[PDB]
């Protein structure tokens, strides 16, 4: 009596809801992983900052005195 | 001018004493000669080539090894402190 299209569309809508739920789960785990990796990587900003500071320090130390060697 | 034997012994002992006196004086001088490779010589005698001309030569560049690491670490700490004080003062 009811149009079969209605039933089949309800079924496929249920499938699409389930799939969206799975997508949400996956994206949540991805966000968790990204947060963890950034929190652990925070030390690399420190390391890069100090290395850059030292590089600039030696560069201007070779500038200040005339001890900067000629370009090979 | 005759002298007593004890006086003569005193005198030639004095002579020998003067001899090694000027010997030691010459030795101390030769240490103090900054004439390293200026006069005929190939050994270094303590002089600016052992001092500021040399040790300072070392020092004007040893800072690039020891004090520059610290300086960089201190600069990062100072920048962090600046960020912290800015955020703390402006947020409230």
Swiss-Prot record, chain A:
It is found in: Nucleus; Cytoplasm, Cytoskeleton, Spindle; Chromosome, Centromere, Kinetochore. The keyword Acetylation applies. The modification N-acetylmethionine is found at residue 1. InterPro entries: DASH_Dad4 (IPR013959). GO terms for biological process: attachment of spindle microtubules to kinetochore; cell division; mitotic sister chromatid biorientation; positive regulation of attachment of spindle microtubules to kinetochore; positive regulation of microtubule polymerization; protein transport along microtubule to mitotic spindle pole body. Keywords: Acetylation, Cell cycle, Cell division, Centromere, Chromosome, Chromosome partition, Coiled coil, Cytoplasm, Cytoskeleton, Kinetochore, Microtubule, Mitosis, Nucleus. Residues 19-47 form a coiled coil. GO terms for cellular component: cytoplasm; DASH complex; microtubule; mitotic spindle. Present with 967 molecules/cell in log phase SD medium. Component of the DASH complex consisting of ASK1, DAD1, DAD2, DAD3, DAD4, DAM1, DUO1, HSK3, SPC19 and SPC34, with a stoichiometry of one copy of each subunit per complex. Multiple DASH complexes oligomerize to form a ring that encircles spindle microtubules and organizes the rod-like NDC80 complexes of the outer kinetochore. DASH complex oligomerization strengthens microtubule attachments. On cytoplasmic microtubules, DASH complexes appear to form patches instead of rings. Component of the DASH complex that connects microtubules with kinetochores and couples microtubule depolymerisation to chromosome movement; it is involved in retrieving kinetochores to the spindle poles before their re-orientation on the spindle in early mitosis and allows microtubule depolymerization to pull chromosomes apart and resist detachment during anaphase. Belongs to the DASH complex DAD4 family. This is DASH complex subunit DAD4. It comes from Saccharomyces cerevisiae (strain ATCC 204508 / S288c). The lineage of its organism: Eukaryota, Fungi, Dikarya, Ascomycota, Saccharomycotina. The gene is DAD4.
UniProtKB/Swiss-Prot annotation, chain B:
One of its GO terms (biological process) is attachment of spindle microtubules to kinetochore. Pfam families: DASH_Dad3. It is found in: Nucleus; Cytoplasm, Cytoskeleton, Spindle; Chromosome, Centromere, Kinetochore; Chromosome. The keyword Cell division applies. Keywords: Cell cycle, Cell division, Centromere, Chromosome, Chromosome partition, Cytoplasm, Cytoskeleton, Kinetochore, Microtubule, Mitosis, Nucleus. The keyword Cytoplasm applies. GO terms for cellular component: cytoplasm; DASH complex; microtubule; mitotic spindle. Component of the DASH complex that connects microtubules with kinetochores and couples microtubule depolymerisation to chromosome movement; it is involved in retrieving kinetochores to the spindle poles before their re-orientation on the spindle in early mitosis and allows microtubule depolymerization to pull chromosomes apart and resist detachment during anaphase. Belongs to the DASH complex DAD3 family. Present with 468 molecules/cell in log phase SD medium. Component of the DASH complex consisting of ASK1, DAD1, DAD2, DAD3, DAD4, DAM1, DUO1, HSK3, SPC19 and SPC34, with a stoichiometry of one copy of each subunit per complex. Multiple DASH complexes oligomerize to form a ring that encircles spindle microtubules and organizes the rod-like NDC80 complexes of the outer kinetochore. DASH complex oligomerization strengthens microtubule attachments. On cytoplasmic microtubules, DASH complexes appear to form patches instead of rings. This is DASH complex subunit DAD3. It comes from Saccharomyces cerevisiae (strain ATCC 204508 / S288c) (Baker's yeast).
């Amino acid at each position: 009596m009811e149009n079969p299209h209605e039933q089949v569309q309800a079924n496929i809508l249920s499938r699409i809801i389930g799939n969206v739920k799975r997508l949400n789960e996956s994206v949540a785990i991805l966000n968790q992983e990204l947060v963890t990796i950034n929190n652990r990587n925070k030390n690399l900003e420190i390391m890069g900052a100090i290395c850059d500071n030292y590089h600039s320090s030696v560069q201007f130390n070779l500038e200040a005195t005339n001890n900067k060697k000629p370009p090979l | 001018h005759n002298l007593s034997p004890l006086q003569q012994e005193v005198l030639d002992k004095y002579k020998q004493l003067s001899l090694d006196l000027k010997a030691l004086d010459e030795t101390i001088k030769e240490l103090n000669y900054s004439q390293h490779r200026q006069q005929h010589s190939q050994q270094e005698t303590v002089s600016p080539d052992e001092i500021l001309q040399e040790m300072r030569d070392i020092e004007v560049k040893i800072g690039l090894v020891g004090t520059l690491l610290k300086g960089s670490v201190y600069s990062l700490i100072l920048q962090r402190k600046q960020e912290q004080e800015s955020l703390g003062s402006n947020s409230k």
